[PDB]
């Protein structure tokens, strides 16, 4: 029962978001910090079930120039294909 | 087993399919693979993850309507997966990455 928390108001960049995910999801040390790497990690590395709690999403969306949305998209696409992921947008 | 960049690239170009030591993520899962466990070599000796669709969401690889990309693990033997991947398109363009998709090198 893996748990990951993102405090959106603390995200000051897209790389900030990737470094946070790297920690929260115990991603490989070689983590590419890009969408392809994230998709790869979610479908071939990460432990499940997983609960991702994304707080202050909008705030993180502003400081990442919509990049926050593309990251959420990967999580949603991984779930769509079978990854046991529960996303909580607070 | 053929799991090196040139060996797999040549194989893809010549037979238009990956070598037999490759299986998709779903197939591996059906064999008992659990990524977080790093048990691929245990449930599927000699196999590497490969053949799954590569979305190319960030458009780093040549994009063209009708062209579909797929990827495969390179240099994998056992345990947890590495950062090496070969990327091949439906029209057989072949690229590689050794830094977990940060940068790509065209090899064919």
From Swiss-Prot, chain A:
Q: Which residues form the signal peptide?
A: none
**What does the UniProt keyword field contain?**
Cytoplasm
Cellular localisation: Cytoplasm
Cytoplasm among the record's keywords?
yes
Does the record carry Cytoplasm as a key word?
Answer: yes
GO CC terms, sorted:
cytoplasm
Domain of life, per UniProt, equals: Bacteria
| Predominant cellular place of this UniProt entry's protein | cytoplasm
The record's similarity note reads: Belongs to the barstar family.
Name the job this protein performs.
Inhibitor of the ribonuclease barnase. Forms a one-to-one non-covalent complex.
User: What protein does this entry describe?
Assistant: Barstar
Which organism does this record belong to? Bacillus amyloliquefaciens
From Swiss-Prot, chain B:
**Practical and industrial applications:** Introduced by genetic manipulation and expressed in male sterile maize and rape by Plant Genetic Systems and in radicchio rosso by Bejo Zaden. Barnase expressed in transgenic plants will specifically destroy the tissue(s) where it is expressed. After cell transformation, protein expression and plant regeneration, the active nuclease destroys the pollen producing organs thus rendering the plant sterile.
Report the outcome of residue 100 to Q: Loss of activity
Q: Indicate the residues that form the catalytic site.
A: 71, 100
Keyword flag Hydrolase = yes
Q: Name one GO molecular function term.
A: RNA binding
User: Where is this chain's protein located in or outside the cell?
Assistant: Secreted
Q: What EC identifiers does the entry list? A: 3.1.27.-
Key words of the record: Endonuclease, Genetically modified food, Hydrolase, Nuclease, Secreted, Signal
Q: Does the keyword Hydrolase apply?
A: yes
Q: What GO cellular component entries does it have?
A: extracellular region
Describe the function of this protein: Hydrolyzes phosphodiester bonds in RNA, poly- and oligoribonucleotides resulting in 3'-nucleoside monophosphates via 2',3'-cyclophosphate intermediates.
Q: Which family does it belong to?
A: Belongs to the ribonuclease N1/T1 family.
- Protein name (record): Ribonuclease
- Recite the lineage of the species: Bacteria, Bacillati, Bacillota, Bacilli, Bacillales
Included stretch of the parent chain: 50 to 157 of 157
